[PDB]
PDB file of C-alpha atoms and ligand atoms in Angstrom:
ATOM      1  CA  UNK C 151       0.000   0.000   0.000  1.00  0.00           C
ATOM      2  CA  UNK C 152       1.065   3.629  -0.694  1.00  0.00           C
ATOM      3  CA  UNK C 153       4.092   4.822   1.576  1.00  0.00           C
ATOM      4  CA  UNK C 154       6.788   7.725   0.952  1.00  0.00           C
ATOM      5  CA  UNK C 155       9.844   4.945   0.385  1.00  0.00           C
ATOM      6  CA  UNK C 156      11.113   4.003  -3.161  1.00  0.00           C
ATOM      7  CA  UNK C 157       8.819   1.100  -3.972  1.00  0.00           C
ATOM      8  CA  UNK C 158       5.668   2.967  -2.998  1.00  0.00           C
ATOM      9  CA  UNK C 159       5.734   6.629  -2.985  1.00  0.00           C
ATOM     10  CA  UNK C 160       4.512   9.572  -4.455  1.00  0.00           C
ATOM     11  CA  UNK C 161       5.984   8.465  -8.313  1.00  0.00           C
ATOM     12  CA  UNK C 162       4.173   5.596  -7.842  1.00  0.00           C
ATOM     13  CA  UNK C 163       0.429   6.587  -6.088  1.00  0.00           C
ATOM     14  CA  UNK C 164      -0.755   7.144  -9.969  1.00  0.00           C
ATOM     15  CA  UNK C 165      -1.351   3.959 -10.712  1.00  0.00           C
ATOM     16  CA  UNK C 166      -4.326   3.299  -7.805  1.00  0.00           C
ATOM     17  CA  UNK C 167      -5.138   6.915  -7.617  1.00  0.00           C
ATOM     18  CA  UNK C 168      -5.132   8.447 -11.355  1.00  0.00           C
ATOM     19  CA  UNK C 169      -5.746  11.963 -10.007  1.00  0.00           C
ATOM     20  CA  UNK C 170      -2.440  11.919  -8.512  1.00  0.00           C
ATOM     21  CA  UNK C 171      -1.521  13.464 -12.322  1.00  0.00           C
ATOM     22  CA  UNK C 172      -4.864  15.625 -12.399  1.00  0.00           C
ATOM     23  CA  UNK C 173      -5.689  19.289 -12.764  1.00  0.00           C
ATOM     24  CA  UNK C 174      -5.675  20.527  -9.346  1.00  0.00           C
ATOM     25  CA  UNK C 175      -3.132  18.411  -7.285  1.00  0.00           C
ATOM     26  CA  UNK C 176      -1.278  19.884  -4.444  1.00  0.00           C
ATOM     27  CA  UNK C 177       1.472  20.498  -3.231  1.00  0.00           C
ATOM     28  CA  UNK C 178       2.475  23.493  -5.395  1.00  0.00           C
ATOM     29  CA  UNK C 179       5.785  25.982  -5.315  1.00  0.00           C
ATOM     30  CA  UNK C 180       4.574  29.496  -4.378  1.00  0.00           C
ATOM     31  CA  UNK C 181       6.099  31.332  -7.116  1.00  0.00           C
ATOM     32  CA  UNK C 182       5.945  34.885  -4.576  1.00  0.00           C
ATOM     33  CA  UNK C 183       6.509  37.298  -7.850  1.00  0.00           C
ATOM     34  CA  UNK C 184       3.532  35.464  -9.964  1.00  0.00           C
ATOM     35  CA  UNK C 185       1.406  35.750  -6.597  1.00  0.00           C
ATOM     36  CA  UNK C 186      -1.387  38.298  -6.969  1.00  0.00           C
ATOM     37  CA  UNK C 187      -2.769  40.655  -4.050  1.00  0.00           C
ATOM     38  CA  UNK C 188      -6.398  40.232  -4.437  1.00  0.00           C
ATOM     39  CA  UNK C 189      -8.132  43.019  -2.944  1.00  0.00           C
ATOM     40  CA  UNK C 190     -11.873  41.128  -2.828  1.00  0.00           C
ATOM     41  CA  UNK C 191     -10.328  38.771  -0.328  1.00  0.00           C
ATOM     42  CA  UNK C 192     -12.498  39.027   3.129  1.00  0.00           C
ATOM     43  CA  UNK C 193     -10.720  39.157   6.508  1.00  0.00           C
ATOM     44  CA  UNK C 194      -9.418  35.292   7.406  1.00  0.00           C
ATOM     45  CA  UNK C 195     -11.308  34.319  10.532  1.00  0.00           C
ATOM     46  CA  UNK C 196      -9.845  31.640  12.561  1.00  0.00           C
ATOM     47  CA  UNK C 197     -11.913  30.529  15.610  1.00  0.00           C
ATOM     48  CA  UNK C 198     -10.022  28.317  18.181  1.00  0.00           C
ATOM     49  CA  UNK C 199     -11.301  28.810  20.862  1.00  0.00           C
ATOM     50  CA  UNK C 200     -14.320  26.415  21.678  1.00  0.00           C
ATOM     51  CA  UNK C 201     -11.829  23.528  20.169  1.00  0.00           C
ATOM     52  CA  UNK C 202     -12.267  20.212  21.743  1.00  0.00           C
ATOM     53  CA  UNK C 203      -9.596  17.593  20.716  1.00  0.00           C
ATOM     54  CA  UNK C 204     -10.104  13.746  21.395  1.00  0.00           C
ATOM     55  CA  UNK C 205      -6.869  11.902  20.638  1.00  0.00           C
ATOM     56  CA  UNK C 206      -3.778  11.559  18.546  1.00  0.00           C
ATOM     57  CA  UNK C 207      -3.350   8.389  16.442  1.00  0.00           C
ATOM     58  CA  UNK C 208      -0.366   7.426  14.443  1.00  0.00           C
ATOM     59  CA  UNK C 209      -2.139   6.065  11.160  1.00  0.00           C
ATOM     60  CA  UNK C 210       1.287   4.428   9.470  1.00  0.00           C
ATOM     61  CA  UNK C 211       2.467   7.527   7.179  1.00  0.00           C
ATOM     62  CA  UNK C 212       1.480  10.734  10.056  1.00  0.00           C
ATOM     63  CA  UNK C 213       0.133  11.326  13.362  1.00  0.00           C
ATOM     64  CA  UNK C 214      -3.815  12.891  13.357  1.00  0.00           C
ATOM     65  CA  UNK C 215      -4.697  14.903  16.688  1.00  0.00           C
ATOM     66  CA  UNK C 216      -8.602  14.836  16.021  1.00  0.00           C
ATOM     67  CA  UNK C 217     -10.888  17.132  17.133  1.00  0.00           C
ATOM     68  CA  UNK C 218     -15.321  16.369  18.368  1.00  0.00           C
ATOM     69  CA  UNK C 219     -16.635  18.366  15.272  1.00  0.00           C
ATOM     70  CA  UNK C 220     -19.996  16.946  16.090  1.00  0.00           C
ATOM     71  CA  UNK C 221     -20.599  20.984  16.750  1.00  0.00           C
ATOM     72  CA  UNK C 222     -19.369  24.106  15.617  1.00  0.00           C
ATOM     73  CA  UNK C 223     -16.861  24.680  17.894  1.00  0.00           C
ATOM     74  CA  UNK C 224     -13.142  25.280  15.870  1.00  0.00           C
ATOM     75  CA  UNK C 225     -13.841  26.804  12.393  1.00  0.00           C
ATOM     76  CA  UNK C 226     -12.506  28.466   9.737  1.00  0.00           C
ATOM     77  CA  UNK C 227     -14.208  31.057   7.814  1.00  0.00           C
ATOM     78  CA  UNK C 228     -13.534  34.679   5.823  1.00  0.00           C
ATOM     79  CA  UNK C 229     -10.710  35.125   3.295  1.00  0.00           C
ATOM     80  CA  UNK C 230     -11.351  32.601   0.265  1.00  0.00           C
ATOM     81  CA  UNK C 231     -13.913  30.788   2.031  1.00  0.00           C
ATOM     82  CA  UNK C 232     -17.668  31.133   1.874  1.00  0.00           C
ATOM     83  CA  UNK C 233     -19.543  29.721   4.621  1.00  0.00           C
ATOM     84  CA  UNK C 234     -18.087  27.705   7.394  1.00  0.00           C
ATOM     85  CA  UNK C 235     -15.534  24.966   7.733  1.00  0.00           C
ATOM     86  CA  UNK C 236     -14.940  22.828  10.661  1.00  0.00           C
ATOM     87  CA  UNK C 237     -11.406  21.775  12.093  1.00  0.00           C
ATOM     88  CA  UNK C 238     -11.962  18.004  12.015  1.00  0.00           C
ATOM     89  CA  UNK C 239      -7.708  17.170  12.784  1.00  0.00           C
ATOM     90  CA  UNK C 240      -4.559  18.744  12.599  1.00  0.00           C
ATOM     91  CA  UNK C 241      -0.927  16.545  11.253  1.00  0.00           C
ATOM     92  CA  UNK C 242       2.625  17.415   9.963  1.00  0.00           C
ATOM     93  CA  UNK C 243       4.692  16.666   7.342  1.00  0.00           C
ATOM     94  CA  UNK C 244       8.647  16.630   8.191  1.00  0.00           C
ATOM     95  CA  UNK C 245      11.663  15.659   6.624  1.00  0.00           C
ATOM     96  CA  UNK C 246      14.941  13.653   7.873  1.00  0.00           C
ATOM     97  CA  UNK C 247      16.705  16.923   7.895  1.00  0.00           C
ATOM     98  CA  UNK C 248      16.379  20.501   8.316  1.00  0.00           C
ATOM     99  CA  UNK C 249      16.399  21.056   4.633  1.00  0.00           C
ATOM    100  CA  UNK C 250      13.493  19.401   3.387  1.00  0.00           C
ATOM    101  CA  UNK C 251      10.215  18.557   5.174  1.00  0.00           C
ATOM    102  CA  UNK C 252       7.472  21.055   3.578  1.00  0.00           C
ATOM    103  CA  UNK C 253       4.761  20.063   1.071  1.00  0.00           C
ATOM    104  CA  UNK C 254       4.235  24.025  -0.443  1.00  0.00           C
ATOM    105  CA  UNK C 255       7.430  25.409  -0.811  1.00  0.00           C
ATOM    106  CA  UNK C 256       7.873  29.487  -1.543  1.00  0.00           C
ATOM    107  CA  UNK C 257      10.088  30.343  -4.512  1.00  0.00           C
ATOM    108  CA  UNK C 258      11.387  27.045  -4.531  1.00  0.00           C
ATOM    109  CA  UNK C 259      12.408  27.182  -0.661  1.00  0.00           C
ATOM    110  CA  UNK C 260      11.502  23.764   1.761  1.00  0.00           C
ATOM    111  CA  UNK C 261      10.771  24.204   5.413  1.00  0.00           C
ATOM    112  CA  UNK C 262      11.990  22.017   8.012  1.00  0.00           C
ATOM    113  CA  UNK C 263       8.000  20.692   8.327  1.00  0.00           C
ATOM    114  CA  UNK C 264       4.152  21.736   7.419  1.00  0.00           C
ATOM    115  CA  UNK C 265       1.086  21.786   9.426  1.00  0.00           C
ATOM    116  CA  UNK C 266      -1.819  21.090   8.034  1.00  0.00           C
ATOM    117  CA  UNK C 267      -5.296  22.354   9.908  1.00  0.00           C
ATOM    118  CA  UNK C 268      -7.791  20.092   8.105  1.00  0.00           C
ATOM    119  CA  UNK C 269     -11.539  22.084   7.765  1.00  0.00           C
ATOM    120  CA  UNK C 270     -15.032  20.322   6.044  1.00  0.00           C
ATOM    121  CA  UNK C 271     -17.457  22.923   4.898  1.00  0.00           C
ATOM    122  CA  UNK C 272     -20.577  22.919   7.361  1.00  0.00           C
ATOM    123  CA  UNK C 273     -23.580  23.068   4.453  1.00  0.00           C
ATOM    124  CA  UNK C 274     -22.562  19.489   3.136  1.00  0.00           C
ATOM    125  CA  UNK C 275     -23.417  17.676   6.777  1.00  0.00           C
ATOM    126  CA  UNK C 276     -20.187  15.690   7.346  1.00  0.00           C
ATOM    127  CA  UNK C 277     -16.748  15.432   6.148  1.00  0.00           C
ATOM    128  CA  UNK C 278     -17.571  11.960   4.213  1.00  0.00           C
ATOM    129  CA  UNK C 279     -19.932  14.254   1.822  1.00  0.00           C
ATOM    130  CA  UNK C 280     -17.637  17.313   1.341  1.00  0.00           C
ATOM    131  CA  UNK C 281     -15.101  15.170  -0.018  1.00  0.00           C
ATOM    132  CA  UNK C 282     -17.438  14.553  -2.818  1.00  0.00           C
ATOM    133  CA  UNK C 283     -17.713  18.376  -3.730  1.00  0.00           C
ATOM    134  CA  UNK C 284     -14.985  21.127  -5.348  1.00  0.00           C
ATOM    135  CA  UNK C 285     -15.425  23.103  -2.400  1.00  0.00           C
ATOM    136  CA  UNK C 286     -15.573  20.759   0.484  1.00  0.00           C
ATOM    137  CA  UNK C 287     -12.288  21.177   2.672  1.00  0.00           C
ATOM    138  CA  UNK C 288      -9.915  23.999   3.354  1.00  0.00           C
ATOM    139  CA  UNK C 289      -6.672  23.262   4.933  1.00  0.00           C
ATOM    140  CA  UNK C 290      -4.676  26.117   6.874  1.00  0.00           C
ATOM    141  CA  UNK C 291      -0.756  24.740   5.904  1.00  0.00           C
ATOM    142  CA  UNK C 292       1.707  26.278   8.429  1.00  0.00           C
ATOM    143  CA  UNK C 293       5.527  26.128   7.926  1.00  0.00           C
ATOM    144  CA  UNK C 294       7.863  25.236  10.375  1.00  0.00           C
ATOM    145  CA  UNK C 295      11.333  26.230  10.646  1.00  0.00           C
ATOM    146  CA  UNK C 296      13.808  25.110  13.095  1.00  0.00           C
ATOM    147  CA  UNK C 297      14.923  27.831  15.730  1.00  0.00           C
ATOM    148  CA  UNK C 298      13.331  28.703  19.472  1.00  0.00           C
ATOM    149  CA  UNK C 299      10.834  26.030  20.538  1.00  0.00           C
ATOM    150  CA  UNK C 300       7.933  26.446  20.250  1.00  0.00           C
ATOM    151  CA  UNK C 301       5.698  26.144  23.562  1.00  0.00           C
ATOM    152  CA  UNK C 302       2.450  25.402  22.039  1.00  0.00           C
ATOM    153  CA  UNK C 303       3.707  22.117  20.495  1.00  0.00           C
ATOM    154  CA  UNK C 304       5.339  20.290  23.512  1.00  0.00           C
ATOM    155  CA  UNK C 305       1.961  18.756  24.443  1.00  0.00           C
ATOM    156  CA  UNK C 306       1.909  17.095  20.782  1.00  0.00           C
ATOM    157  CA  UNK C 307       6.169  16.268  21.370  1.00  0.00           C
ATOM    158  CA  UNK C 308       5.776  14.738  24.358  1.00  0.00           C
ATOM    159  CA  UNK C 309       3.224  12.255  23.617  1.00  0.00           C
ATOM    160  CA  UNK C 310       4.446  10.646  20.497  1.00  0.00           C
ATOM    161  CA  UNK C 311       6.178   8.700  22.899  1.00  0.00           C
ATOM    162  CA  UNK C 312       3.173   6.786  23.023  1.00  0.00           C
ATOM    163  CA  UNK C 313       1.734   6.639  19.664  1.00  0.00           C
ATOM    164  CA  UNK C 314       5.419   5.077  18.117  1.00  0.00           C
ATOM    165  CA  UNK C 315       4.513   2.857  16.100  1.00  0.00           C
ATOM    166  CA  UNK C 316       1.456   2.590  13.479  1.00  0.00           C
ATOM    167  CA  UNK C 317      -2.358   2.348  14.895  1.00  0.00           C
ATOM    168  CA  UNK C 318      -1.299   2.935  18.442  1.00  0.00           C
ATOM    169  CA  UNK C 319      -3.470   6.426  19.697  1.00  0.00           C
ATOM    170  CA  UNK C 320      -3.817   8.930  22.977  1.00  0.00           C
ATOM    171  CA  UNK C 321      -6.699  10.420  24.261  1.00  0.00           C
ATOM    172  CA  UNK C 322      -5.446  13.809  23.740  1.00  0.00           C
ATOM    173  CA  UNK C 323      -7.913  16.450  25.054  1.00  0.00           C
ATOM    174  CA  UNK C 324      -7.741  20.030  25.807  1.00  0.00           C
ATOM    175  CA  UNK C 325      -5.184  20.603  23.118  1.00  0.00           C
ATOM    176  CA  UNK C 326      -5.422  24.157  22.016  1.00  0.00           C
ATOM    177  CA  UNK C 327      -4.776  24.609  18.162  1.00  0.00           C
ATOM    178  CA  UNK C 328      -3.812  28.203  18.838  1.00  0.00           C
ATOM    179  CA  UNK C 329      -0.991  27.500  19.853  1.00  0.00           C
ATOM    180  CA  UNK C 330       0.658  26.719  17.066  1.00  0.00           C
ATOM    181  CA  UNK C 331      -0.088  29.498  14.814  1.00  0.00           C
ATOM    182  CA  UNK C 332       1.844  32.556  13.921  1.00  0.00           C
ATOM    183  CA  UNK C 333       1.495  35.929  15.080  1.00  0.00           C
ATOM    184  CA  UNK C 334       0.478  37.171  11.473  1.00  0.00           C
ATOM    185  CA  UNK C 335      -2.351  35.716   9.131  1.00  0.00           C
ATOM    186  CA  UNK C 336      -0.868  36.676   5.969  1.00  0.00           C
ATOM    187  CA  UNK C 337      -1.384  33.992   3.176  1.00  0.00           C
ATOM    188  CA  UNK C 338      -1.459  32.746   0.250  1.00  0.00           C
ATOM    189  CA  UNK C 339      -4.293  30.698  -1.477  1.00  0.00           C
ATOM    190  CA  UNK C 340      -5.341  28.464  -4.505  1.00  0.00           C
ATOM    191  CA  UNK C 341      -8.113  25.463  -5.271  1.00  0.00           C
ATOM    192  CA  UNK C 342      -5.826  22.039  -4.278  1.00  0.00           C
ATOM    193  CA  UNK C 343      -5.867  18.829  -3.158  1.00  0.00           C
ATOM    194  CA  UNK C 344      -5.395  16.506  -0.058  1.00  0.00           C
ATOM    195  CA  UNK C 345      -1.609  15.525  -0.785  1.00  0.00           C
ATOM    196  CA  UNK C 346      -2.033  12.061   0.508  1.00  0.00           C
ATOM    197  CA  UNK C 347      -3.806   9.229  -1.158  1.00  0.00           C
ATOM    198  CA  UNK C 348      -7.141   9.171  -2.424  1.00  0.00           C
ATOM    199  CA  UNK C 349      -5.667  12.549  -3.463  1.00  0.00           C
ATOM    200  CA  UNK C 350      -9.521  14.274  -3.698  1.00  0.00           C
ATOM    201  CA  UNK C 351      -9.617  17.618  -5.090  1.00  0.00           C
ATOM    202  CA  UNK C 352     -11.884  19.244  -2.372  1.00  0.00           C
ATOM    203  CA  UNK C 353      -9.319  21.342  -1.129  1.00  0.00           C
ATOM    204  CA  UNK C 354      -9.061  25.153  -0.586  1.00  0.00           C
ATOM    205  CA  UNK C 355      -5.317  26.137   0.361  1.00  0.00           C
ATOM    206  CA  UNK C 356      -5.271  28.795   2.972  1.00  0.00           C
ATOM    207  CA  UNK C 357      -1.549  28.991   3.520  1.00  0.00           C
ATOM    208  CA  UNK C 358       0.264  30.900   6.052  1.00  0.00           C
ATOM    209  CA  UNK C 359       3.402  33.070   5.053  1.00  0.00           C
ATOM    210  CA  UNK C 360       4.667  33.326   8.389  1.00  0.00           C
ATOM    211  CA  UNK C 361       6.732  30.400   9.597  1.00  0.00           C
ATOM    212  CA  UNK C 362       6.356  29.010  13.107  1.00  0.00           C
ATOM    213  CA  UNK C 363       9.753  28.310  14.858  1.00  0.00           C
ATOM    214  CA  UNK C 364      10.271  24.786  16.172  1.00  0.00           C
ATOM    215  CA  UNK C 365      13.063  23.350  18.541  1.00  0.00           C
ATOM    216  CA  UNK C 366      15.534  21.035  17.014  1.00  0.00           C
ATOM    217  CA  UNK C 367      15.156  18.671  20.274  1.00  0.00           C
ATOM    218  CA  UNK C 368      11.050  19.171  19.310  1.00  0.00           C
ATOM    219  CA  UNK C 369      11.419  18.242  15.517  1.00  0.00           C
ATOM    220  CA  UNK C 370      14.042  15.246  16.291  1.00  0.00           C
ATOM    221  CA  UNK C 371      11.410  13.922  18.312  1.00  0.00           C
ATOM    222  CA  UNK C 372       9.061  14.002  15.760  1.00  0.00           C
ATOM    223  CA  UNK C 373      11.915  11.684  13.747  1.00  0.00           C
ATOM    224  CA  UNK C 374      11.645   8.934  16.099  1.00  0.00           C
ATOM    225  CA  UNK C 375       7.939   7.983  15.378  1.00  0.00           C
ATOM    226  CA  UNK C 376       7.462   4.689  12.949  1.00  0.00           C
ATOM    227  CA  UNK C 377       5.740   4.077  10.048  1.00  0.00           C
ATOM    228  CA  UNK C 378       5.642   0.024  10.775  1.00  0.00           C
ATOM    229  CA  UNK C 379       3.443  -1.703  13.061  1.00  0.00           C
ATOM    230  CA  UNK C 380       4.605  -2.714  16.386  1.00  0.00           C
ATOM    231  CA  UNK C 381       6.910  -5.058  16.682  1.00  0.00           C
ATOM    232  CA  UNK C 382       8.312  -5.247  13.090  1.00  0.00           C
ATOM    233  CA  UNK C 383      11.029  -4.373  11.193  1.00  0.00           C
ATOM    234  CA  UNK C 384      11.826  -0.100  12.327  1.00  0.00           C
ATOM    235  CA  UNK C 385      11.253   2.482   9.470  1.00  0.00           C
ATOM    236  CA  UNK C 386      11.412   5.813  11.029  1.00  0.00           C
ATOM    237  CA  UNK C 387       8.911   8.125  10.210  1.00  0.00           C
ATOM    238  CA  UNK C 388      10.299  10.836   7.977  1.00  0.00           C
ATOM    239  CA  UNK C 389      10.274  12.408   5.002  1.00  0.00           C
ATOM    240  CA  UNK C 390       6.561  12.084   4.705  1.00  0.00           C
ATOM    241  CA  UNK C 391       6.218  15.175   2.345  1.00  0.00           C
ATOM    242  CA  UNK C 392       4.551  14.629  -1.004  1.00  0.00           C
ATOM    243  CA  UNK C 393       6.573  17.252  -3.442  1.00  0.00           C
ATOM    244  CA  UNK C 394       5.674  20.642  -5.344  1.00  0.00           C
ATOM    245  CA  UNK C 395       3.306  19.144  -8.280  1.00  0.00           C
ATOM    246  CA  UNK C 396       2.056  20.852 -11.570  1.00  0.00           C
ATOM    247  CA  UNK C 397       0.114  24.505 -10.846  1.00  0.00           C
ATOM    248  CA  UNK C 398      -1.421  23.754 -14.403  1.00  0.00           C
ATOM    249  CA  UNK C 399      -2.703  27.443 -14.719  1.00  0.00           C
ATOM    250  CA  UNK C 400      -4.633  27.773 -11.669  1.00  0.00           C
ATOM    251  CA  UNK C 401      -3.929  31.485  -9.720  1.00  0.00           C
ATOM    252  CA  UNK C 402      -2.459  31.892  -6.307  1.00  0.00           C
ATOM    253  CA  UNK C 403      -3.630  34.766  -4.673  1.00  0.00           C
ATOM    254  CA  UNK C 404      -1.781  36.862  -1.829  1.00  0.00           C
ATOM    255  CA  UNK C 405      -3.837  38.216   0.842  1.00  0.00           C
ATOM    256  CA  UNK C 406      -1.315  40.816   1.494  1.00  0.00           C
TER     257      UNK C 406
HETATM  258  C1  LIG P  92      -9.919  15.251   6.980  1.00  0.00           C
HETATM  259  O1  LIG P  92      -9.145  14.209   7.239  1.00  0.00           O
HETATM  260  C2  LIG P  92      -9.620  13.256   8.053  1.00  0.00           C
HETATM  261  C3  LIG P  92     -10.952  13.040   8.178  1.00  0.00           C
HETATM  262  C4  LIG P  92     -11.433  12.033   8.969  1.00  0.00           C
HETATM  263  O2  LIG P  92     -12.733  11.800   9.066  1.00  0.00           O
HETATM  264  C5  LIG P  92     -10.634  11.209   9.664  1.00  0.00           C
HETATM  265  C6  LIG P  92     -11.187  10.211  10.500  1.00  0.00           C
HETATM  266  C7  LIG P  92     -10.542   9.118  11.165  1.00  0.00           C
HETATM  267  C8  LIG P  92      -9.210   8.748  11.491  1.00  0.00           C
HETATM  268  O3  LIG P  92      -8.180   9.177  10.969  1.00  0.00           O
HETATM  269  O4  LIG P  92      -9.073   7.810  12.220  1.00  0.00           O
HETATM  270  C9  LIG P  92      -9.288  11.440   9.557  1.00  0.00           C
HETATM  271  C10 LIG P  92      -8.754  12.430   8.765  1.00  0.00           C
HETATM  272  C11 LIG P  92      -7.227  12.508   8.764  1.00  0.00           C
HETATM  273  O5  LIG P  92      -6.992  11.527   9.640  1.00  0.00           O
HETATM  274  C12 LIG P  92      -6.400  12.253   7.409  1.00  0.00           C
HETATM  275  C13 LIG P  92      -5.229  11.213   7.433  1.00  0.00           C
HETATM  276  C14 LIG P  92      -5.137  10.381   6.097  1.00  0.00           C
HETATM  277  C15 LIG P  92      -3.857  11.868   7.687  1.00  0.00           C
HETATM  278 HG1  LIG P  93      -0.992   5.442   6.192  1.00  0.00          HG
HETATM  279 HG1  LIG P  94     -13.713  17.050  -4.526  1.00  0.00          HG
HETATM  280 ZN1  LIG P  95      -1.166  17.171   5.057  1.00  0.00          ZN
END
């Protein structure tokens, strides 16, 4: 089954998921001088507070903290977006170095990791439906860069202690999501995909162009998680990035 390692990973998801080569596939590079400001963009609105997460689970390629969307509680609304979108989980993608790590990359440039803030629009009923429709997710992506720790993500660091090895899961409640964004909401944003397998393009990119900082102690940690089961042979998690994939004419705007 689909992986990030030579035999099965992104050069080869294609061949069970033909829209890995389609028209609106993400990742994409930000190309920051072909960027427009776009002027009709609304205020983003990004409502944390009320979150309620449940657990974190390793699922074999990333680690999902999920939140109770069963109400609107965390949502995400304004900027591209019409209507309302509920946080349903938050993951990562990292690399096995400083260098690399990022899905989006910005004039070519690769973070250290990405965040990725996973909304459903609210007027298709659950997230099982909006992945049926053009307009069914947006996903906040936040890049990480390695520097000062940062505070809000030692909760996440220091359980993945427990969640090693693929399918094991925390109850991880009380996690506050604001505490891992940046202090400005500048981004960018185009019409995308989820950049793991099935690959369903549903997605509206909302992404930040503030870096957070992360420690290097906090990101190593993060390096130690498995992709295998427990008990077998040990593949450490990393490099689970998909990269930088045709734009094929679609626009990115700039909110700034
Ligand atoms: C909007 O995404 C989701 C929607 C979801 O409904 C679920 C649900 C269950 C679970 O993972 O056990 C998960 C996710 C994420 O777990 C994606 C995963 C493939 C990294
Ligand atoms: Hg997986
Ligand atoms: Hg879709
Ligand atoms: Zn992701």
């Amino acid at each position: 089954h689909w992986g990030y390692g030579k035999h099965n990973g992104p050069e080869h998801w294609h061949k069970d998921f033909p829209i890995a080569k389609g028209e609106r596939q993400s990742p994409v590079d930000i190309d920051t001088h072909t960027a427009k400001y776009d002027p009709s963009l609304k205020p983003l609105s990004v409502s944390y507070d009320q979150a309620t997460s449940l657990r974190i689970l390793n699922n074999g390629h990333a680690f999902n903290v999920e939140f109770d969307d069963s109400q609107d509680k965390a949502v995400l609304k304004g900027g591209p977006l019409d209507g309302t979108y509920r946080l349903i989980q938050f993951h990562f993608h990292w690399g096995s170095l400083d260098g690399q790590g990022s899905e989006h990359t910005v004039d070519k440039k690769k973070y250290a990791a990405e965040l990725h803030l996973v909304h459903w629009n609210t007027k298709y009923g659950d997230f099982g439906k909006a992945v049926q429709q053009p307009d069914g997710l947006a996903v906040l992506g936040i890049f990480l860069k390695v520097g000062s720790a940062k505070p809000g993500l030692q909760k996440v660091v220091d359980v993945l202690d427990s969640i090693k090895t693929k399918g094991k899961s925390a109850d991880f409640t009380n996690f506050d999501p604001r505490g891992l964004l940046p202090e400005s909401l500048d981004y960018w944003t185009y019409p995308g995909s989820l950049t793991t397998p099935p690959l369903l393009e549903c997605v509206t990119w909302i992404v930040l162009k503030e870096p957070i900082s992360v420690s290097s102690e906090q990101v190593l940690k993060f390096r130690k998680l498995n992709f295998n089961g427990e008990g077998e042979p040990e593949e450490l998690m990393v490099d689970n990035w998909r990269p930088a994939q045709p734009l094929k004419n679609r626009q990115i705007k700039a909110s700034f």
